[PDB]
Amino acid sequence: NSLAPLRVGILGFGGLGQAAARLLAPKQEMKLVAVADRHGYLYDADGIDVDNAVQAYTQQGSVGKAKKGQMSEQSIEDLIGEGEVDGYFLALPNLPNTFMADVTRQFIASGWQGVLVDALARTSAVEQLITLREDLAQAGITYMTGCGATPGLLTAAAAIASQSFQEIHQVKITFGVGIANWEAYRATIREDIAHMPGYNVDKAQAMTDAEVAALLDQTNGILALEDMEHADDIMLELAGICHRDQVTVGGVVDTRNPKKPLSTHVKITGRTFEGKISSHTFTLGDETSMAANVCGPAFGYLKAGYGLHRQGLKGLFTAADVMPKFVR
Amino acid sequence: NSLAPLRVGILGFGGLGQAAARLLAPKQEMKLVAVADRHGYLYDADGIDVDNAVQAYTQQGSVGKAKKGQMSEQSIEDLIGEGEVDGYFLALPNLPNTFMADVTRQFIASGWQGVLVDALARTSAVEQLITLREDLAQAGITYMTGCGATPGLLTAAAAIASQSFQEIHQVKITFGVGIANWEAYRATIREDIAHMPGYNVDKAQAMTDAEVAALLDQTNGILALEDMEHADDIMLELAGICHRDQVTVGGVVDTRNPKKPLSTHVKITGRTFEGKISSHTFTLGDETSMAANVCGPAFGYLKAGYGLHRQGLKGLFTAADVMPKFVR
Numbered sequence A, B: 001n002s003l004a005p006l007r008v009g010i011l012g013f014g015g016l017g018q019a020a021a022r023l024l025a026p027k028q029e030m031k032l033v034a035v036a037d038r039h040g041y042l043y044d045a046d047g048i049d050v051d052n053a054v055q056a057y058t059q060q061g062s063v064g065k066a067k068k069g070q071m072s073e074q075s076i077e078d079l080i081g082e083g084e085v086d087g088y089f090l091a092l093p094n095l096p097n098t099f100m101a102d103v104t105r106q107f108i109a110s111g112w113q114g115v116l117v118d119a120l121a122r123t124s125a126v127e128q129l130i131t132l133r134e135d136l137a138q139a140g141i142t143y144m145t146g147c148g149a150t151p152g153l154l155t156a157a158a159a160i161a162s163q164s165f166q167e168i169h170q171v172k173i174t175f176g177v178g179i180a181n182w183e184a185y186r187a188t189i190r191e192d193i194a195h196m197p198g199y200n201v202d203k204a205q206a207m208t209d210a211e212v213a214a215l216l217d218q219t220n221g222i223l224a225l226e227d228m229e230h231a232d233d234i235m236l237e238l239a240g241i242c243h244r245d246q247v248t249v250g251g252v253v254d255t256r257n258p259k260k261p262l263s264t265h266v267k268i269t270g271r272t273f274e275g276k277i278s279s280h281t282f283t284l285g286d287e288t289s290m291a292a293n294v295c296g297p298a299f300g301y302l303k304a305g306y307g308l309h310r311q312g313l314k315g316l317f318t319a320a321d322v323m324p325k326f327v328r
Ligand SMILES: C[C@H](N)[C@@H](CCCCCC(=O)O)CC(=O)O
Pocket: A121, A149, A150, A175, A176, A177, A191, A192, A228, A251, A253, A264, A284, A288, A289, A290, A291, A293
């Protein structure tokens, strides 16, 4: 596959998409050929120049401003029809809550076939993609949903851990995030503030940077989120592991420190066939960033998705359903 | 599937096979219809009476002595041709080191198609099954190898954990086992003593219970095993995650205490795309027995294997390659 690498694209070029591009750079079996943001796109069948695209984006507002870039207010539509791309990572803020589904309906409408991957967080966003299962399948698209850190990595770990038990009692995810680069987080931070007490997507999305800084001042830069609406729950339910109500997700983001404020882990509790109650724990290393734990799994699921696609398996899959494949 | 459960069988009815039978009892989507040991077999398309089979085995030396049992010195051959069985768990001591492969060659020769699962430990035993890949595929058999605790559960956890990293440095497995029931462990204990310093399969297999008790007396019932030949290594290599030399397996079995002498875990170390070195850790609950952590995953892989089989996917798969499916 070093002779014929998987040709991939990234939609959305905020902090996560940019990290995704950097992660792809040293891969030999995967090549980044396509990036789109809201106001432009960049295609390069020979492989994207990541430094140039990042410069363009951060200094001129869009990758359409990069060498070989194209400005466009229909960048996704234009990009889909421009290039030979085997799969895309949808690194798109789900703002509003319908956006990911709407982008997916454009892939469907386009006639394009291949693999799509997302790192959606919200159960209700994942439910919108579930409504599209047959449309995806009929379109010839293998869609990998919730394939980030959580849902994703931690969800798959819980699916594996569950095999020791006759019955599952609880899957509890606690995450920590330290923000190293403010620019890389603003434009997703409202997605998180929406999980705050007395907030929601519409309210958070409409906040000014002034109002955000004010909220953060109160809690010293810390967003402690409990019992989040998080698609891990329906994913583990669709995989037959447990009911969604037995899955709980919470976490802490420290907007003022690059160090994780706590060690991310998932605890899986259940009863074994011998009637013993016990828990497995999967814990992430403190020096693995949000970016690595989201984008790493995302492309491992893209690779896995492609394997499925190449076997004629189309439709919607979750992180809980298949083994991601290590990308080299 | 409660109307048409997967009909499964177990070959070998020492401690692990017996535990496997008990684990299957409450399942509604999987039904134990077939058990064989060296000197007899038991088939019952309506579902095995586990208490009766265990009584027969432990009190009369074979399940062939159970109500509906048949004595036979070709029990595997006879069983394969007797019943409608969708998949078998091969709960067989690999003694000698060629035995599992030889049983597998009988399934091949028989014309039977379906799923086979094992919980093999040794790299060299797994390599013998790798030589049979095409024979398996041509025979219409989906073979799931190394699908126990380690290899198996812990190997799959390492495969998932690896997705955060650009390069893997080390996968380190440390296991603990407390023996609760001596009868349930003797007849596999020689497999472990073979990993001892200054021992091997042939030497260990030829030891008398006298000589075993003597060895154990020296170390107070404790078998501390380091750098074991363990198939986790080639499995993670075949899945493209790391070289076999970066996988190390050790553990402790306490023959004199039902409590685990240490907490079983796997530590996965690597470098992320940002150049940070870090480790994830997956730890098992102390009250999850060897039996639960081996047999639970084994049947989850059988179920997964069947899914593959039903899609026309035949040949050899490892725990590292696919997501096991929770059996209810
Ligand atoms: C709050 C985040 N946006 C996200 C979780 C990131 C988990 C990272 C795990 C780690 O790197 O340890 C959850 C969310 O967006 O709801």
